[PDB]
Amino acid sequence: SSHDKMLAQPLKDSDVEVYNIIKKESNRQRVGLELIASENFASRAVLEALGSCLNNKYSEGYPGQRYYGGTEFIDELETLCQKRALQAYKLDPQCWGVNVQPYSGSPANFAVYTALVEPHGRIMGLDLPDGFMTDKKKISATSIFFESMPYKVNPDTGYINYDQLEENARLFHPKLIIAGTSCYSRNLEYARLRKIADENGAYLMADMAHISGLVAAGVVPSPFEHCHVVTTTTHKTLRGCRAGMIFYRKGVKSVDPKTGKEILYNLESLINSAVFPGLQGGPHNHAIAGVAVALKQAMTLEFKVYQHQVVANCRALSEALTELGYKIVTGGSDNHLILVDLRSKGTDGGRAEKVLEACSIACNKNTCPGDRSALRPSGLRLGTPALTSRGLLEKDFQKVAHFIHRGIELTLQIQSDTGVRATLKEFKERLAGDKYQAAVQALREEVESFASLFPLPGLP
Amino acid sequence: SSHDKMLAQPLKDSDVEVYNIIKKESNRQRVGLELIASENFASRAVLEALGSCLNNKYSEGYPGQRYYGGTEFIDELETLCQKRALQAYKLDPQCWGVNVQPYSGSPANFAVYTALVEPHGRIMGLDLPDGGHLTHGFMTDKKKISATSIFFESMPYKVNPDTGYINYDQLEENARLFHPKLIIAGTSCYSRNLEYARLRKIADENGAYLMADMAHISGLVAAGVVPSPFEHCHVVTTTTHKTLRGCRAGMIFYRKGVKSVDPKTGKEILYNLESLINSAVFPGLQGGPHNHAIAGVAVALKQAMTLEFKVYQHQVVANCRALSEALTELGYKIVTGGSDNHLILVDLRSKGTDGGRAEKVLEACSIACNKNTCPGDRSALRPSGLRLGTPALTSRGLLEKDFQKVAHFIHRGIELTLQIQSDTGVRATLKEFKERLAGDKYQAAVQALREEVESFASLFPLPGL
Amino acid sequence: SSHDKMLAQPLKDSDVEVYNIIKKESNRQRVGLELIASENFASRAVLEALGSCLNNKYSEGYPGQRYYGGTEFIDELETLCQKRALQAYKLDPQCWGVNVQPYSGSPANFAVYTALVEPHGRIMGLDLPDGFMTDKKKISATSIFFESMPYKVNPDTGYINYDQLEENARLFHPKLIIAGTSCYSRNLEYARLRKIADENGAYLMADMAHISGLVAAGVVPSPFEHCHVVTTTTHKTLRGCRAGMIFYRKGVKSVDPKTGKEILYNLESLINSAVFPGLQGGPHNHAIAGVAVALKQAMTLEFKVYQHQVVANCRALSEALTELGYKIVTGGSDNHLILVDLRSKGTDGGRAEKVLEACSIACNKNTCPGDRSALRPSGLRLGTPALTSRGLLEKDFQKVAHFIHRGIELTLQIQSDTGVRATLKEFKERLAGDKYQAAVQALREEVESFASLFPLPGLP
Amino acid sequence: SSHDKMLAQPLKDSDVEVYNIIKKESNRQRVGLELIASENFASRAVLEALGSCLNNKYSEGYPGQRYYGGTEFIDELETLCQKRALQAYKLDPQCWGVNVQPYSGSPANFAVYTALVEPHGRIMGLDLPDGGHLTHGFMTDKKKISATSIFFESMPYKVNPDTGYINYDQLEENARLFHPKLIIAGTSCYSRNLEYARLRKIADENGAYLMADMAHISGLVAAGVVPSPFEHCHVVTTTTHKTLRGCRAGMIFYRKGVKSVDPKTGKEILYNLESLINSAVFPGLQGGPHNHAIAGVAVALKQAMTLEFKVYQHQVVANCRALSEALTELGYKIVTGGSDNHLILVDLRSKGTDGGRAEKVLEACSIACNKNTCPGDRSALRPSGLRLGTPALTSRGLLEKDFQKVAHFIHRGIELTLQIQSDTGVRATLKEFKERLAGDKYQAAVQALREEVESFASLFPLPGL
């Protein structure tokens, strides 16, 4: 019965190519060390929920205002998901509302923009290379469909120039202030941004994606106390699937003493109209189920213990890097991400990242505060949200730092052999050169011996 | 301690609520009759590929222009997926390019819009009550609803209410006055084929691009039973589920090679849609692609290239024709006479009722249906037609005699609708009708009907696991 | 000293160049036959009003809401002007308002566009070649700042296709539909356009610039019966200065059946804000005084007698031209214009009109349905009211008909001698032939001796 | 018969109402004292040229590319006018071009905007409450008022509230963040000179154009007493009256010739602003130009090229310095310390009052002035400064002692205003101030002051007629 078995044949028997590809990817992820702030591993429950039968049911609409029938279970599931989302951050249901229909973070941001900014409006957000539009063309859709004037961080101290921000806000008259960032270890002053938005009558939007889990454990002050709209995601902190969440205020905005009447919020209806049928159509029920499972798993004491272990291991890694003689800029860090400058060592960030990738070591490259050169980014970024989930410890992070030191010594040897005056092309030519490849091979094997010890969460 | 079990505990033991919800949903879908056109059941291979470790790896960028390291396996997988996509439609790789980065159909449509329309431009697509989609342009005189109508200027063309076919003459006359930049060829409720040759001629006369939307007929194009629009259209946006039995994703096919030749100088002009689409998709709108979705699309495309898929599509169209003839045998008014696809539109005005009441009554007896307006209706909030789809049941093993039995069941349901409407009068409202559905008078009849249809549905298996 | 003379010396003593230029222009205008429909001759009263001391006063704003002090006289003058404007068309002041601040017709159109179209909106109006935007670029500012698609008349008969207009407007959803014409001299069904606007909830715009004074004499049905906003100029019919007027509806728009309430018109405030301080600044008081004098002179029986003489002379000229074998197209026209065709003779309108300008006869080409090319026009439009303002009678119009017949004969002779396949520059060179120069000089002497008998209105 | 009596009747016999209105206006202008900066009396030659028969002739089009016929005289007049305009400012015809077709300053500004800014672009002009003009961009948080703010995106820069000079540093820092396409250099209530070199450097660093507006100094640049901005600016729009003694019109000067050369290929780039400006003026916004206005501005430009004009401008600046020193001696605070142009701004916060009431009190005694906010005022509804213009009275033949007498009269008026304000209290509203002004107690004093100033002003003639 091959005709009936076609819909029931396993993946190993149906397509061996993708099966071998997935097996090789799992083998690489198991024996390869990962040091990336955005990299993590999801639990098995969310993986089982993604492969559920909810991928077939079409559920356009909202509970009580659906378009199709037989959506009682879907409505109950989404209600449970939104209740768990509201309870995870300890928010009053009468004043806060959550939406999980957007597919990811960028669609959620675009929906919020179409709902609030009234395209061709004015936005004020943080600059891209400081943690986006050009004079010749516009790359990001936010600059294409909307007008934005970014504010620059102070190049001397490294903090937001609040006086210049207020001046540019009162001179530009924006409609929404973006209180979000990608590379900023210091905590933002949400109260000052809130009072600025109240003085200018604009809204405040925060982006707590990269810290979505850090706020869950109460390690970072919650931005829900001042910001009106709070957009975030579910991965890179919560070990969940790829989805987006939007938090908006509900209730009375401010009572008007001129007429004695009160004004109610209107963000809920605008957002609900912007998500559907504005941009997206049928939501992903499996994604909502995975998000609900991740949110329920995050509301346990084990999540707080894991976050404490994360911050402790980050502090231990910073201390180990400082002990060996490395210069950690910006006075360490106040979050999980770690930024180090290897300019004084005599090695470039991109070359070091390439040599680390050659020996099964992962990292990230980004510019440093006060951009001085776009061709030589020396802001090598480190993070361990996934190694802590696997079961790494500070005594093991000492050996990880020893491996990083061996890698930087290999990079120094390569730069001394090929020459510091050599361009990037001839350097890329000598990554797999035999001259020292055996040494590089050594830098691989021991690393593998360190990777096969710890297990890999997921499906067996 | 408990940290090792937290990342390894099964969902049945971790969260019993969502487990019971999924079990109840599967039990409902097993004993139910699904007649929605955009409804199908994915295979086990796609479900297993979606729940792989690819959800952990971040793969922002394009092959050869990646931003991070260690992307060999992801690049190989995406290359295999795009090769299978190009081979599934028998397209020359030197003349056609495929992109699978968009998350779904609407993101792909918005990406093509921001790439080619040059926002604040002019768009002409199919009207929504005439079988169009929300992304094809929809706006009223009061305010704009769809994002395509907000960011762009859309003017949809009307369909001929007498014969039911698209009035190509009115479109040609309006193209000279409106001067559009891109013509949308996409249908959601339409039982006939489109004249892509005349649309391409009009686009060349007006100097505009052509964007086809083969969402429903996609799998049909995989079987060769429907003329492929790749012969005339420039851009082609399509989905992966619906009928192709894949995960929720979108695919964009664009032209490559020489677009035109200058007769005077002789210089060869090359296409420029590839770079624009690649820039609009990333980092224009979306960020990190879903590797699991790409793997599922690749598996579905590999499974579609078999003869079993063509046999399944032939059985789908045969059961569609059988259901159509069995329903027109009972005296039901069918628009346009027949159907050239899997979806059919049954008109209820010949029975003295509307589509909403019949859809709700079918919903009461576990019969999946959807309402839709007919060409020539005086109001959009009171639809008179019902949309039925064959492949949802055909994927389970339904036959011609079984389809005739389901047609008799829908006839009995329509008789029940007429009885309930005559019991509450002709001047009643819809709330009173819904209250009469849950009444004790018709409780026994609808209960017996639901039990009968559930016993009939329990004989066929349900794919998944 | 010299300061007492610099601001007191006449124009003849100050600058002799512009003085001689004005003298030559007046001499040319004295001996000649201006056959353009747009040209006219203003009275001496408005000429003295333009040279008044009102040019020094720099006033801004509207009466009762001025910015500077001591504007009582300007406010009284503007009130008298608007009262005379309302009384000239027999309009109820409680339902109609008039504004004279716009400088000309196109500024008034742009002001009402910024007031009622909400730029980046939708407009529906007649195109250029049927009495405007290209496929590559945009020429008019209306297509640049606003989106618009034109509706075209049927090619067989030439009347407005109202059914196709309804079918297009039902899907295009226009915000304001205009009703104007420059070469389509057939009456428009304003009731059907009003019904269309009420069905689509849009506004109706009228352009009575060509028939403005013709509405003052009651010869043409007034478009104020159905149209909401009616713009018009001040010259070419009423013999006034360069200015424009905007008429808008006032009162209750419609009754609200929900609670028995009523919706009042708000076009007044929008038009006022768009005019000032939207586009223009300080209005021209001299222009206001001139248009006020013109409106006061137009409300007399002499104006109606002049319009009757205009239409009688137009009928007589059309009959005299038809008698001489010249095929008049569309049976002439309705109000004041005639259009002779020369395609039956063989020569185009361009050669005839350039020979006419060579023999001191003022004519101009125009685009009409049938003449698919502007470089080779077949339509020669003339103008009646100028000769009537100069005092020409029926026998005088017959003499002008004999003169234009002789001119067409001379043009045909020139074309036959130079060849029908010759280019335009060959025709220009043949126009300077010895015998042709003698003939055109004789014709010029004849027409100058004919025109010297009739006086020229203006300053002594 | 009737046509000889209607079209030849004088204005006094035809319409007596407008005749009496004009007579009353002339009497008010002769007996009253005007101190507004944007006020002047045109010569009799311009008034005679305005009333010529040129109003009848239509001149739609450009010289050499006309549409109608018989325009040789109008073409020669426009050529003479543009030649006089080019020669008045000592500009090379091969490098500069002039256009006089715009009707006024605002239409010319809008034409330059729609020609160069590429609407929906970004502009940076001077703020309205900081001495700027309304056409230079002005918008609030609730809605947009100016058409420039509606069609374009404008972000104005403020003036230093401490010293009173334009903060070029803040403008330079904001130019890199806003990325403007055109920088506006213009003002209406600024008593100092502009640093056009710094603005040109900022524009070259940002790659944007520099649009100058020399309206209030249109005459000052003619006599060479103020440095000309043509050395750095590309496009300069100006008026024809205010301080030039001409009719209502506007002029636009644009650069011509080679803009820059390519260092790599060696090919020189030519300017393209001429064609864009010509297309934006006609048939972009306006239609048929005013030949009488062209003749009047030509006469004014020919009269301005004499030595009497330079002597008049020197007398204006001397009387302005004398009035400034008299106001400083009278204990009144002068903004920015002095004035380098014809206009001055006197602050009233040093005496404990505002300009709103003082303006109307001066108007009650036949003293014309205008209120304006001072740099540092927290509310635009209560302005504190008063703007005074010397060239309005200098055109009649006043001297330093005459301006000192006017300053003494203004001081007495300010004393009366302070007395009236103290009589009604500080917490009183402006309407209560108006009602208290109607009382005979102060009405007798203001009437005596009005009689005195009228008897003083009647001793001087009034140009015109």
Swiss-Prot record, chains B, D:
GO CC annotation terms, alphabetical: cytoplasm; cytosol; extracellular exosome; mitochondrion; nucleoplasm; nucleus
Keywords on record: Acetylation, Cytoplasm, One-carbon metabolism, Pyridoxal phosphate, Transferase
EC number(s) on file: 2.1.2.1
Cofactor(s) needed: pyridoxal 5'-phosphate
Principal EC category: transferase
GO molecular function per UniProt: aldehyde-lyase activity; glycine hydroxymethyltransferase activity; identical protein binding; mRNA 5'-UTR binding; mRNA regulatory element binding translation repressor activity; protein homodimerization activity; pyridoxal phosphate binding; serine binding
GO biological process: carnitine biosynthetic process; cellular response to leukemia inhibitory factor; cellular response to tetrahydrofolate; dTMP biosynthetic process; folic acid metabolic process; glycine biosynthetic process from serine; glycine metabolic process; L-serine catabolic process
Regulation: Inhibited by tetrahydrofolate concentrations above 40 uM.
Pathway of action: One-carbon metabolism; tetrahydrofolate interconversion
Pfam families hit by this protein: SHMT
Modified residues (N6-(pyridoxal phosphate)lysine): K242
Keyword Signal among record annotations: no
Primary location: cytoplasm
Domain of life from the UniProt record: Eukaryota
Catalyzed chemical reaction(s): (6R)-5,10-methylene-5,6,7,8-tetrahydrofolate + glycine + H2O = (6S)-5,6,7,8-tetrahydrofolate + L-serine
Xref: CDD domains: SHMT
Annotated localization: Cytoplasm
NCBIfam families: PRK00011.1
Homology family: Belongs to the SHMT family.
Primary role: Interconversion of serine and glycine.
Subunit record text: Homotetramer. Identified in complex with ABRAXAS2 and the other subunits of the BRISC complex, at least composed of ABRAXAS2, BRCC3/BRCC36, BABAM2 and BABAM1/NBA1.
Extra facts: In eukaryotes there are two forms of the enzymes: a cytosolic one and a mitochondrial one.
Protein name per its UniProtKB record: Serine hydroxymethyltransferase, cytosolic
UniProt source species: Homo sapiens (Human)
